[PDB]
């Protein structure tokens, strides 16, 4: 506590560049694990269609699969629009 405070005050003087660099690197390491928008970034990456969505052959047992894009069933992007 006191010794750590003395060390940080002594380093903040005469070595400010190193203190700033270590603080910025530590923040870059720690903060991503706590942000709630990281999962939003993952979902945004998942929603980017690079390939053609290959249709599935209907077999009479696929209720959650849409027959047309306009159909209500299927993934939505309203969370993306509101963002």
């Amino acid at each position: 506590a006191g010794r750590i405070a003395s060390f940080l005050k002594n380093a903040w003087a005469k070595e400010p560049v190193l203190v700033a660099s270590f603080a910025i690197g530590g923040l870059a390491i720690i903060l991503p694990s706590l942000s709630p928008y990281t999962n939003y970034a993952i979902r945004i990456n998942r929603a980017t269609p690079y390939n053609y969505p290959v249709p599935l052959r209907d077999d009479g047992n696929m209720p959650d699969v849409p027959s047309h894009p306009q159909d209500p069933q299927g993934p939505s992007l309203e969370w993306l629009k509101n963002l």
Partner: protein, 70 residues
């Protein structure tokens, strides 16, 4: 007296030789069979021995590949 206190009868050595010969002959025929079996397995490769690895087919991805023709 010497025969009684130091030695045994001919039956013991006779039958011990019988057993020893039987064991050794079995070992010889086993060795010959083992050599022949090794030769056959290395030639055909249909046995448990000399099995060389091939590519595991669980690594193949069975999915649409952005192109209908793979």
């Amino acid at each position: 007296w010497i025969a009684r206190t130091f030695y045994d009868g001919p039956e013991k050595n006779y039958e011990k030789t019988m057993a020893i010969l039987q064991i050794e002959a079995e070992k010889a025929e086993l060795r010959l069979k083992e050599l022949e079996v090794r030769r056959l397995m290395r030639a055909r490769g249909d046995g448990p021995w000399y099995q060389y690895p091939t590519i595991d087919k669980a690594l193949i991805d069975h999915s649409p590949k952005t192109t209908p023709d793979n």
